[PDB]
Symmetry: D2
């Protein structure tokens, strides 16, 4: 409908501030990605509150659905929200009562996406896998995208693999809102995700993160 | 070892109660277990016409009908000849809650399904009692082990009139009849279910499902 | 008028938890206006039960609640014709139960047709391992939703080792007769107790006390 | 001698963000810890007029203000002079979700409250963004120990215009600052909370709460 100004190779700048279980932190991010291939990588550095007393994994989905491969037949709300950009709000509900909220305001200047991220988490039990740092990774997921109360909404059944091979369940709901008027809303669709910490130092003060995401219509034609 | 044929017949009897309304539904169909495809003709034998949306029942009418790749353990085909059973909760966003069970056995080239379905707390003016549902959207079941039992969780959504959606969370626990059947690792199962045809009051329904198991990105 | 100060209670429950079928008969007595009732239960089929008896006990009638004059008593007003209820029980470890009761009256006896189904209880959870001790006293929040009287409760089972096991209850209550006036928002305090039982819980004596009120500061 | 005096003052500063809207609210109040009664005058310092229902904030503006009987351990009065902190989640039935924190300290006759409040996913057409709330109904908080921490769960409801209700589930975790403060057994805390008065835009609000601990039936 208009030129997004999104290049096949983009830079990513990010600042997160937040508080989990009373512990304040600031984390900076610098990365690169390929929006049309749905792939991105980022180097993160804890600037305040290091070392973190909680599992770094709970934060990683808060570190942009622009980085998702959208096929021609599915409306791409995220790429169409640029150059102006968009924002999202998210709740994360963990099976043991831990609850997080998160926000990201996403803008673009030239070849770089800028991200102002906030993350707040409460009610994580002392001996749960989050405060005990017993998480290994997020398992691959599928986000369900649909218009709810006039707003594009993504719901996800997520699972963290734990040490000892158990899983730890988290339900995610994200609301996505374009900054500019006139962005077409998509029909129901699915977005496959996989996210991975490629490397980190001992205290997770420095972390290299990667995501791959692909939009599709599900069976039978996916 | 499983004795599962490339073409199988399916016999089904469901009895249940939703909102205090009792019903009995018989099913006769055929499927291709290794293609993850199946079809069934359903007939309401008691309780017709149903005062609620037929769609709430349809996932209760067998993960044997899922295409499993070699690298993922197929718990369901490995549960035969002896068979398996499942229990399910369906939690809808307006407080409607269903439970369902199915005991699955096999005799020759026919699967037998003893199905029970109970639903409570559906609001009088919600999309279920008002029959405003159109279809289940395609879904992806998350398969994992919890307390020694294979468990599938799904973020499901019913398409409604006007292209609204009505959310339902599914949890299924699957248990082989035979002791010591090997549990699979974490995996995904893509699903799509469709009422191909029905009469006006949904006393007669033709149902279809396609399901494929996979490892998610980046492999799938 | 229809309901007497001393009433008798007849009950038949049929159900299935974890794939295990059972039938339980009940005979008891209660004082509706005092909100008190007692019942002797007997497992007729499926004994000994392989799960915690405690999960069943709220399924074994809000007629047995003391309602003050300033709150509409939907339940006593539903007789002689009677009423029905549907319930979901959502336990914190994924166990989910649904239950129904059709309540009728003839003479001085209430009759209860009860159904109870439970799924997805973990093998090593407190229910399948029978590690529950009692329900803690609760308060049911009563309100109207989509024309129907609804009760929500944050409940808790005390377990061996003194931990608690959380359950959320939603009940929908429906009078048989049309035109029964719905109450305003109110609270109902409950306490439920197994007074006695044999080793396998094939025979159980159950007791409940319930009192309706307006909450602080008027309670 | 006692850290808790019959008549105490309350100073409070809340900062927060609901649906992207930043705000700062100051409070000055007085209360009677032993009678479980308190009142506070609140003033929106930044972000007025608030675009959301003020009612969602009100339980975030101290369980020291609760009448505890002799037979129930009073964790909150035992937490002073050093103080305590709480974290809370508020889960509304339409997907709006809030988290809040309060760090409570004491100097002389005054409690000091550092409060943070964050809310997301409230729909534009819902009662919160539409400002259609009237009051919280009277509630009963269920207090119990989980993983060594005092925890309170509440089935809450806002009364709406037209006399419908809007449900919210609250979980609070309470933690004394000092080591070795004895945890109480299971108990109930009754609450009622009321906006006594406000100006048109809720830039100025006078708030009141009454709370009483008890053991439930038959004890109460
Ligand atoms: O991002 S994927 O490689 O987990
Ligand atoms: O079974 S699918 O085509 O909905
Ligand atoms: O019924 S009360 O005594 O638990
Ligand atoms: O404190 S009460 O009056 O809502």
């Amino acid at each position: 409908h208009h030129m997004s100004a999104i290049k096949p190779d983009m830079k990513i700048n990010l600042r997160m501030e937040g508080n989990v279980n009373g512990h304040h932190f600031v984390i900076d991010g610098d990365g690169t990605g390929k929006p049309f291939e749905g792939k991105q990588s980022m180097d993160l550095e804890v600037k305040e509150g290091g070392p973190l007393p909680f599992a770094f994994d709970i934060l990683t989905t808060a570190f942009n659905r622009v980085f998702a491969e959208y096929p021609d037949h599915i409306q791409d709300y995220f790429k169409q929200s640029f150059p102006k950009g968009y924002s999202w709000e998210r709740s994360l509900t963990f099976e043991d009562g831990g609850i997080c909220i998160a926000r990201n305001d996403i803008t673009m200047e030239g070849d770089t996406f800028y991200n102002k991220v906030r993350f707040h988490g409460v009610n994580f039990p002392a001996n749960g896998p989050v405060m005990q740092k017993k998480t290994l990774k997020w398992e691959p997921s599928t986000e369900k995208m649909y218009v709810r109360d006039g707003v594009l909404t993504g719901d996800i059944t997520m699972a963290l693999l734990l040490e000892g091979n158990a899983h730890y369940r988290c339900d995610s709901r994200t609301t996505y809102k374009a900054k500019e008027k006139g962005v077409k809303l998509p029909g129901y669709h699915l977005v496959d995700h996989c996210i991975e910490i490629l490397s980190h130092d001992k205290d997770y003060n420095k972390v290299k993160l990667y995501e791959h995401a692909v939009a599709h219509s599900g069976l039978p034609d996916n």
